[PDB]
Structure 1
Amino acid sequence: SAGFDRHITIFSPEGRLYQVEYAFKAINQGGLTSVAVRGKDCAVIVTQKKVPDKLLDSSTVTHLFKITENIGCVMTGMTADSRSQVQRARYEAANWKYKYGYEIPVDMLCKRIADISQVYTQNAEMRPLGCCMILIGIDEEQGPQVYKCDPAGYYCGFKATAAGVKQTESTSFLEKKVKKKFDWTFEQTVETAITCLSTVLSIDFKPSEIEVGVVTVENPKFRILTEAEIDAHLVALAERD
């Protein structure tokens, strides 16, 4: 059943879209990895950071973007496709604010990108961009919001999500952690995320080779934690554990 594989619009006899699945395979091909966790009043995203050359600038190399003031995103997948998707999300957020006159809920922004990807999977154009995009934001009524926008058309909302190579182990660890008192504090959520990534990686994190972003019900802005914050959290929290 490998003949139904060379076009995004031809079903397999068992009802599978192989070049939709291969987009997820590309996600895994991204090499990096990402995780996100939402607490009672905070949302925290943690992500790899590979700098395999002294000349690469850490100021530019980053996979935590600011789609708008209140909404932030972590990418997992090919960098070019990721940045195209980021630009699209910025465009759609701006257009929403312009037309309907209020900041786009994370619900809708993830829905909108999911629908763009769906259009591409149905009409045999583009080449479904291979990135997984995880959005964090603050919603006035429900509270914190963490959503994932896979490159096949799901925009699902998550209590704790993982993307990339270590997605399975990350999901297992996050289930284990969530089953115990999901009401987490700001520092406890930052931990849960960083500890999940560290354990699934079998590594201990330097304060630089990890990118962490956070939003809170008191700070509804996409704060990219600096080297100081990363170091402080890692050292102090691992010590006090």
Structure 2
Amino acid sequence: GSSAGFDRHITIFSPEGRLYQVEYAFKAINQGGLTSVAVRGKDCAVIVTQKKVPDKLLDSSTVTHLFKITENIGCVMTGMTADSRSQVQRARYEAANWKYKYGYEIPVDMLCKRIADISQVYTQNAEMRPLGCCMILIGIDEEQGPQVYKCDPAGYYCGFKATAAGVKQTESTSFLEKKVKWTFEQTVETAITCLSTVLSIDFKPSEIEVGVVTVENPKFRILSEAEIDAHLVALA
């Protein structure tokens, strides 16, 4: 836990070889108080996220953490809201550019890597802080099937079978660890169950958000309140 000079203020190495500012950025993801879970099925990918809107005067439809990057790529953001929006805007641009210059749709892992590389620059340059958010990407790849990727503030990215982010990230990881060691309905139910179990909450249709991509219908889709209700009743 040693420190020296300005190592807790800017992204420079501390005596132990750590980057405190990057570590503080991970704590900024938990400031929002939400948890997200992504599960990969045999032929589908599902993203579920907590939807808290206790303001009441807010327009519920505009409050969301699920975004469409391209026609076949969806994503869920966790952490600082404004930081997330800019990261989503950047990802949309990166994908559009890739298609334009290479003539084909950007692979999910290439997009995640591209976002991770942009995040890395903030951890090496002192004049700007890292974004306080986390991005999880899902989509169907022609040969590898359903993909689930996640990149953080450090610029680290990885592919997962199942993953999570936010306040209850650690417990979601443990819960899914046992389960992993699946049909569309099973993958969706697994995701909702993980979120419900770690949060100790019997979810209602308008309290969660669901995004999916399947081998049959690759287009990223958001489930409606009625579609989510069907799954919620089957789990009960």
After TM superposition, the score normalised by the length of structure 1 is: 0.94
- Mean Cα displacement is larger for which, 130-139 or 27-36? 27-36
Q: State how far apart, in whole Å, the 1-side matches of 2:93 and 2:15 are.
A: 38
Q: Would you say the 8 A contact 2:12–2:126 is kept in 1? A: no
CA distance change for structure 1 residues 236 and 2 in 2, over 3 Å: closer, same or farther? farther
As a proportion of its length, which structure holds more strand? 2
Q: State how far apart, in whole Å, the 2-side matches of 1:206 and 1:3 are.
A: 50
Q: State how far apart, in whole Å, the 2-side matches of 1:63 and 1:5 are.
A: 33
Equivalent in the alignment of 1:200: 198
Q: State how far apart, in whole Å, the 1-side matches of 2:9 and 2:27 are.
A: 16
Structure 1's consecutive aligned runs of 4 or more residues displaced over 4 angstroms after TM superposition are none
Q: State how far apart, in whole Å, the 2-side matches of 1:18 and 1:230 are.
A: 40
CA distance change for structure 1 residues 3 and 202 in 2, over 3 Å: closer, same or farther? farther
Provide, for residues 123-155 of structure 1, a one-character-per-residue CA deviation record: whole Å limited to 9, x for no partner: 223321111000000000000000001111111
Return the offset for 1:10.
1.7
Q: In percent, how many aligned pairs have the same letter?
A: 100
Return the offset for 1:237.
2.9
Return the offset for 1:2.
6.8
CA distance change for structure 1 residues 205 and 38 in 2, over 3 Å: closer, same or farther? same
Q: State how far apart, in whole Å, the 2-side matches of 1:237 and 1:56 are.
A: 29
Return the offset for 1:120.
1.3
Q: Aligned residues, how many?
A: 233
Return the offset for 1:160.
0.5
- Cα RMSD (Å): 1.1
Consecutive unaligned residues in structure 2, runs of 5 or more: none
Q: Would you say the 8 A contact 1:4–1:18 is kept in 2? A: no
CA distance change for structure 1 residues 86 and 11 in 2, over 3 Å: closer, same or farther? same
Return the offset for 1:3.
5.0
After TM superposition, the score normalised by the length of structure 2 is: 0.96
Return the offset for 1:4.
4.8
